[PDB]
Design an enzyme around this catalytic site. Structure first.
Site, short mmCIF file in Angstrom:
data_model
loop_
_atom_site.label_atom_id
_atom_site.label_comp_id
_atom_site.label_asym_id
_atom_site.label_seq_id
_atom_site.Cartn_x
_atom_site.Cartn_y
_atom_site.Cartn_z
N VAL A 27 -1.83 -2.06 -42.16
CA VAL A 27 -3.07 -1.77 -42.12
C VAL A 27 -3.38 -2.64 -43.76
CG1 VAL A 27 -5.31 0.00 -43.38
CG2 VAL A 27 -4.19 -0.12 -41.04
N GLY A 28 -2.25 -2.03 -44.88
CA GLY A 28 -2.14 -2.59 -45.88
C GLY A 28 -0.65 -2.55 -46.02
N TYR A 32 4.09 0.13 -52.94
CA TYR A 32 4.77 1.26 -52.79
C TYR A 32 4.93 1.50 -51.63
CZ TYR A 32 4.08 2.68 -58.12
OH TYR A 32 4.35 3.26 -59.58
N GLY A 33 4.35 0.83 -50.38
CA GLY A 33 4.31 1.34 -49.35
C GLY A 33 3.52 0.33 -48.82
N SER A 34 3.87 0.91 -47.44
CA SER A 34 2.82 0.21 -46.07
C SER A 34 1.84 1.24 -45.42
CB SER A 34 3.69 -0.30 -45.42
OG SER A 34 4.84 -0.29 -44.32
N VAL A 35 1.08 1.39 -45.19
CA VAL A 35 0.14 1.85 -43.75
C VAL A 35 -0.35 1.13 -42.42
CG1 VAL A 35 -1.99 3.42 -43.72
CG2 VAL A 35 -1.35 2.89 -45.63
N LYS A 50 1.46 6.63 -43.75
CA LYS A 50 2.35 6.46 -44.56
C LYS A 50 3.69 6.27 -44.78
CE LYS A 50 1.60 5.68 -49.74
NZ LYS A 50 0.39 6.36 -51.47
N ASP A 165 -6.70 7.60 -51.58
CA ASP A 165 -6.28 6.65 -52.81
C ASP A 165 -4.69 5.73 -52.01
OD1 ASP A 165 -5.47 5.65 -54.85
OD2 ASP A 165 -4.92 7.17 -56.55
C1 LIG Z 1 1.50 9.09 -56.07
C2 LIG Z 1 0.00 8.98 -55.23
C3 LIG Z 1 -0.41 8.52 -54.21
C4 LIG Z 1 -1.93 8.66 -53.80
C5 LIG Z 1 -1.96 10.05 -53.94
N1 LIG Z 1 -3.07 10.39 -53.47
N2 LIG Z 1 -4.17 11.17 -53.78
C6 LIG Z 1 -5.04 11.39 -53.07
C7 LIG Z 1 -6.69 12.21 -54.01
C8 LIG Z 1 -6.76 13.64 -53.55
C9 LIG Z 1 -6.41 12.67 -55.15
C10 LIG Z 1 -8.25 11.94 -52.65
C11 LIG Z 1 -4.89 10.77 -52.02
C12 LIG Z 1 -3.30 10.38 -51.64
N3 LIG Z 1 -2.80 9.57 -51.06
C13 LIG Z 1 -3.13 8.96 -49.55
O1 LIG Z 1 -4.74 9.19 -49.32
N4 LIG Z 1 -2.75 8.74 -48.99
C14 LIG Z 1 -2.87 6.94 -48.17
C15 LIG Z 1 -2.43 8.31 -46.52
C16 LIG Z 1 -1.80 9.00 -46.47
C17 LIG Z 1 -1.56 9.54 -44.91
F1 LIG Z 1 -0.72 10.11 -44.99
C18 LIG Z 1 -1.48 8.27 -44.12
C19 LIG Z 1 -1.88 7.63 -44.33
C20 LIG Z 1 -2.54 6.64 -45.71
O2 LIG Z 1 -3.21 5.80 -46.16
C21 LIG Z 1 -4.50 5.87 -45.29
C22 LIG Z 1 -5.00 4.34 -45.50
C23 LIG Z 1 -5.91 3.55 -44.94
C24 LIG Z 1 -6.95 5.45 -44.25
C25 LIG Z 1 -6.52 6.02 -43.87
C26 LIG Z 1 -7.12 6.60 -42.91
N5 LIG Z 1 -8.56 5.75 -43.02
N6 LIG Z 1 -8.28 4.84 -42.92
C27 LIG Z 1 -9.62 3.73 -43.27
C28 LIG Z 1 -8.58 2.85 -42.44
O3 LIG Z 1 -9.09 3.32 -41.32
C29 LIG Z 1 -5.23 6.91 -44.63
C30 LIG Z 1 -1.26 10.71 -54.80
C31 LIG Z 1 -0.56 10.91 -55.32
#
Ligand SMILES: Cc1ccc(-n2nc(C(C)(C)C)cc2NC(=O)NCc2cc(F)ccc2Oc2ccc3c(cnn3CCO)c2)cc1
Length: 344
Positions: A27-28, A32-35, A50, A165
């Site tokens: 996905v990306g 800092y990492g990959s998804v 992620k 994010d």
């Molecule tokens: C240092 C740092 C960095 C980030 C944050 N931070 N802050 C927030 C708030 C609460 C402020 C909004 C959220 C987060 N972090 C993420 O949102 N991390 C992504 C993430 C986490 C997972 F557990 C799994 C996948 C992830 O990436 C995706 C990518 C695309 C995705 C999904 C889903 N749908 N789709 C569309 C495609 O279909 C998920 C805080 C501190």
């Protein structure tokens, strides 16, 4: 019981995950990492995973890792990403070096929805409503997103939306963070407030209405030039609030620009959408509308329900003031991994 893990290389990243997660696809990816997207064979649903890249390589990375896991474990809201699972292949703190985070996979990001669907004004109402609803919750935890842009909004075919994010630090489907940044944070004008995120929402809403990036600046100087061409240069009252002397001296050096009448910029838009835009894209963030206030705006009359716009439980951010070593940030993170409890 520790699941059986399997290992797999995908676009140069090595993924070691429980066998419940299959068909991993990219996905990306950034520094800092990959998804990846995957299929969770336990539930039959698609998930996003992620993997942080070398999350304990430095103090800044270790603290970022912990912050993200703390925050994701806290977020329990329909319009914000939540944590389905967090795992590590490591069996002890000693061998803990990788963190994986899992959430429900949404169809697409807000960019890809524009390519696929034709967003009527009703769609725009619903999408922006959900952003603001999620933002109200986030802001209520004393969190500022700071990075809102269409690639950080996950949307399904039903136009249900979640704020996330990616946090991957990508640079040139590219969407520049600066295009959605409020000037007071982009240029470090002053101690800024949560409504920097409302600025971003205004930029997103504008783009949903017009089809084009409202302010596609190529650098911070061009970015501000484009902004002030719409909203005009700061007047005396706001200049005095620019407490950075260098920032204020720069702004004062620019040719004055008049504020535009948004009714003449957003031709053919719902008047209530124009009126909301005029309240979000206020230069002076003491005057900018908040998420809670914006939810009450007549533009959202079809969706607004003050008894279903919930706030967050208290979020303990005392870790933010701590100056710890890598191994201490690593151990707090490990604790949070071990204590995780899936939602039901
Ligand atoms: C240092 C740092 C960095 C980030 C944050 N931070 N802050 C927030 C708030 C609460 C402020 C909004 C959220 C987060 N972090 C993420 O949102 N991390 C992504 C993430 C986490 C997972 F557990 C799994 C996948 C992830 O990436 C995706 C990518 C695309 C995705 C999904 C889903 N749908 N789709 C569309 C495609 O279909 C998920 C805080 C501190």
């Amino acid at each position: 019981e520790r699941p059986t893990f399997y290992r797999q290389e995908l676009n140069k990243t090595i993924w070691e995950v429980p066998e419940r997660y299959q068909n991993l696809s990219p996905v990306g990816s950034g520094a800092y990492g990959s998804v990846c997207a995957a299929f969770d064979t336990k539930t039959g649903l698609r998930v996003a995973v992620k993997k942080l890249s070398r999350p304990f390589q430095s103090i800044i990375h270790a603290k970022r890792t912990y912050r993200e896991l703390r925050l994701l474990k806290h977020m329990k809201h329909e319009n914000v990403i939540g944590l389905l699972d967090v795992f590590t292949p490591a069996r002890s703190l000693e061998e803990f070096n990788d963190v994986y985070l899992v959430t429900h996979l949404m169809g697409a990001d807000l960019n890809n929805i524009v390519k696929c669907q034709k967003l009527t004004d009703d769609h725009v109402q619903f999408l922006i409503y959900q952003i603001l609803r999620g933002l109200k919750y986030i802001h209520s935890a004393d969190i500022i997103h700071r990075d809102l842009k269409p690639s950080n909004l996950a949307v399904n075919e039903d136009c249900e939306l979640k704020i996330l994010d990616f946090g991957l630090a990508r640079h040139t489907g590219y969407v520049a963070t600066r295009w959605y940044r409020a000037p007071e944070i982009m240029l470090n004008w002053m101690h800024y407030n949560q409504t920097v995120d409302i600025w971003s929402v205004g930029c997103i809403m504008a783009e949903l209405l017009t089809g084009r990036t409202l302010f596609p600046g190529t650098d911070h100087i061009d970015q501000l030039k484009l902004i002030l061409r719409l909203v005009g240069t700061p007047g005396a009252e706001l200049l005095k609030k620019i407490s950075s002397e260098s920032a204020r001296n720069y702004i004062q050096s620019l040719t004055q620009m008049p504020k535009m009448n948004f009714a003449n910029v957003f031709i053919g838009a719902n008047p209530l959408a124009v009126d909301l835009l005029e309240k979000m894209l206020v230069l002076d963030s003491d005057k900018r509308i908040t998420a809670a206030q914006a939810l009450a705006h007549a533009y959202f009359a079809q969706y607004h329900d003050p008894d279903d716009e919930p706030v967050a439980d208290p979020y303990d951010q005392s870790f933010e003031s701590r100056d710890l070593l890598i191994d201490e940030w690593k151990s707090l993170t490990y604790d949070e991994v071990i204590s995780f409890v899936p939602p039901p």
